[PDB]
Design a protein around this nucleic acid. Structure first.
Ligand SMILES: [Mg+2]
Ligand SMILES: [Mg+2]
Ligand SMILES: [Zn+2]
Ligand SMILES: [Zn+2]
Lengths: 251, 172, 251, 172
DNA sequence: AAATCTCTAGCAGTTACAGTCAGCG
DNA sequence: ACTGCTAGAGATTT
DNA sequence: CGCTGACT
DNA sequence: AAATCTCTAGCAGTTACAGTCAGCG
DNA sequence: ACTGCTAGAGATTT
DNA sequence: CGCTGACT
């Protein structure tokens, strides 16, 4: 093509220059510069720089645990209304969770549950429970907590409220349900200045990626599917999902 | 009839206590296994219902687990037979479907309530809030023109829009 | 005033409601509602939600260390040009740093240094060095790394470049200075598409707060001074600086 | 004369090696204590200067620490007497001001260079970039109308502005 | 005052331990 | 074959 | 010389 | 194509260890 | 008495 | 019964 290209590829393969550097230095255009950059493997680390949007449907209920004063709280949430069904778990295991989902189905219309791939929520007991109750068990990415993001924020506010009213109890579970009362009925804002009971009642290629807490971005893999927020891929019959923030596509 | 009216009761199935609240004006029932007769788990229960539904009044008797001043304090902070036997018979039905009793208790409460939920919904044109692609800001009141399945037909001030249900909320 | 106010203060002092809740519920205006909220101590946690702007003057030079492969790198930076003077430290102590600042004064015009309150940079040796060289030693907040933010980002890119060219060496310090070459002369962008040598040569009340990694926000204290980004305060003759993101003022 | 010209040399003060590069066309000197005569610390030194200044050419002799192929490889990747005695005399002066020799070496380099810096600046109207309050975006080319002390007088397309020097950069 | 932008902490399984040195006894 | 968010605090315009 | 606390 | 918004990871002193359970031997 | 930032990657308008 | 790995 032009010997500037060859020396640009030697230059690049010694220094890994960016596209502006090779382009302006060796008097080249930006396109072929970005093709030399994009032809490289090592330089392709950073991802797409964009969050998604969690599914906000009436029949969805987020679910996750947290930790406080040595105790393990479980928290159920409605995506739309910000409502809470929180309680203390005496010791986290799957059976107690299944009993809790039975408790949440007997009070609130549940259709499907969106939580993480934690130990409990994959057990068979939970599966039999949501099976009996006509509830669809959905999961998300393991190492992308923001996929559950809604519930995570609730923990903050829940803990925040426990900062205010822990001196009004001799036990934890009491103050927990007190915080639930405050957040669901006594605090207002958001939609139109409603508390969560008012809202909840009103409603009712070459693709590089990383995972596994491994900052070593992965080699080329075969894109299977593109949606809005995550994608599905194949690296030697390794069918897997990746969120777009943690991935890059080479057309 | 008033919405904030709850009738309380308890039974002793399998020699184990079960404590039940009933929304009178809808017959809506929540029953939970109480381990022990006392004001502690009682006030725990009314504290749950307090933050699970808008209580204003509980109707109950002179039992010791109810006259306990812990009840009066937690409640100060907070501000039917045929149903007992209904849930009793349903528990009789689904007892062999689940080993633990508490399980089948909540299964009977589930059966009665959904198989009264939409009744309490009935006790208490439309406005729509929505999000576009790559713009997590929630958007203004959108005049609902039609509610579909998987998509919805809205109108803002200058744009009749399609929005999938995964990005919408419909509130009066 | 109005008995609605008294019951609003009982309500608040039992549930710690927000201003919209008390305002709409008990049929009150938002101002006195926010005065009941602002009259409270516990509810006043969150801060001001705003970053500042680091001083970008020619005579400033950021300075900080980092860690890699068991070794402790030291990094000097120019705020304006993005230029680097990086090297390996064989074992971090203050004397070696003072020798490094002497090295950086003998090559580059230094006027003042902006780094953190780490062990080294407070020793007396450094003070004698910048004393001899006419260099002014400036410090920042302890637990606000973003005050040095510039240099922190450099470490990322520096480490990023070491991801690309670590296979071109038998030793670390070599690859370090190689990365320095790449970033300062061979990469371009930012201002007008310059590399850092081109730029560097072209140039040449009641106030609640927290610190100490302590999420317990502090009681009322007496504001002494207000600037743009941080403030100075007094809690029982405890004269101290706080950044505004970690503080709240009650007029 | 060319800017990318560096003359190399070394001396042995206190029985310790010192390696010096000199910008010929400005006489600008950087001298560093090398622990041992070899191509390793040498190529380390030219690798530093390579990323500290835009080298194109080094003029040097047939010493073994220079003909070492490590020099040729690191340099392939990379692409006066009266000064030696000048720094020798200055080192003689400030030797008693600092215990370690390397210290006083860099003190002499400091003395010579600043007490040649602005010479290399001289080897290689104005445009101004600025930031307002609470808007970390960097702003467009602003026509410098006056450079002050602690503040500067700029002009954008419609607003002659004051900006403190702590929020400005002035580049040709 | 009354609305309407604009923006950030901390939530995410979680910390007791290392490394230095000015200052006080 | 899936997806970041929430509640305050402060400017700023009606 | 300890060693403390203070920040990293 | 050539510019000009718009937005996010990781940098910040740093991790090897706990807690469960579906699945495979 | 002091203050978050940088470099890419992707839409989008000239 | 181990125990592995996998996610939290
Ligand atoms: Mg979780
Ligand atoms: Mg630091
Ligand atoms: Zn490259
Ligand atoms: Zn309060």
């Amino acid at each position: 093509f032009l010997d500037g290209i060859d020396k640009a590829q030697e230059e690049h393969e010694k220094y890994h220059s960016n596209w502006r550097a090779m382009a302006s230095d060796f008097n080249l255009p930006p396109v072929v510069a970005k093709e030399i950059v994009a032809s490289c493997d090592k330089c392709q680390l950073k991802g797409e720089a964009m969050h998604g949007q969690v599914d906000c449907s009436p029949g969805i209920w987020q679910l996750d645990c947290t930790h406080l004063e040595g105790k393990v709280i479980l928290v159920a949430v409605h995506v739309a209304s910000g409502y809470i069904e929180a309680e203390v778990i005496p010791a986290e295991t799957g059976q107690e969770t299944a009993y809790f989902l039975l408790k949440l189905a007997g009070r609130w219309p549940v259709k499907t549950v969106h939580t993480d791939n934690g130990s409990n929520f994959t057990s068979t007991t939970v599966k039999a429970a949501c099976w009996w109750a006509g509830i669809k068990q959905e999961f998300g990415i393991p190492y992308n907590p923001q996929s559950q993001g809604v519930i995570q924020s609730m923990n903050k506010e829940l803990k925040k409220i426990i900062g205010q009213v822990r001196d009004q109890a001799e036990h934890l579970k009491t103050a927990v349900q007190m915080a639930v009362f405050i957040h669901n009925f006594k605090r207002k804002g958001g939609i139109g200045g409603y508390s969560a009971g008012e809202r909840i009642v009103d409603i009712i290629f070459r693709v590089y990626y990383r995972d596994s807490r491994d900052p070593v971005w992965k080699g080329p893999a075969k894109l299977l599917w593109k949606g809005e927020g995550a994608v599905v891929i194949q690296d030697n019959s390794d069918i897997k999902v990746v969120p777009r923030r943690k991935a890059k596509i080479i057309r | 009839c008033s919405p904030g009216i709850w009738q309380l009761d308890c039974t002793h199935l399998e020699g184990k206590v079960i404590l039940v609240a009933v929304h009178v004006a809808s017959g809506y029932i929540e029953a939970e296994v109480i381990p022990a007769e006392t004001g502690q788990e009682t006030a725990y229960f009314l504290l749950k219902l307090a933050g699970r539904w808008p209580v204003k009044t509980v109707h109950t008797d002179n039992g010791s687990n109810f006259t306990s001043t812990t009840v009066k304090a937690a409640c100060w902070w907070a501000g039917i037979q045929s149903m007992n036997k209904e849930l009793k018979k349903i528990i009789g039905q689904v007892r062999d479907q689940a080993e633990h009793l508490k399980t089948a208790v909540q299964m009977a409460v589930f059966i009665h309530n959904f198989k009264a939920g939409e009744r309490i919904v009935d006790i208490i044109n439309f406005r729509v809030y929505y999000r576009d692609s790559r713009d997590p800001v929630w958007k203004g009141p959108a005049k609902l023109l039609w509610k579909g399945e998987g998509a919805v037909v809205i109108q803002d001030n200058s744009d009749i829009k399609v929005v999938p249900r995964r990005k919408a909320k419909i509130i009066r």
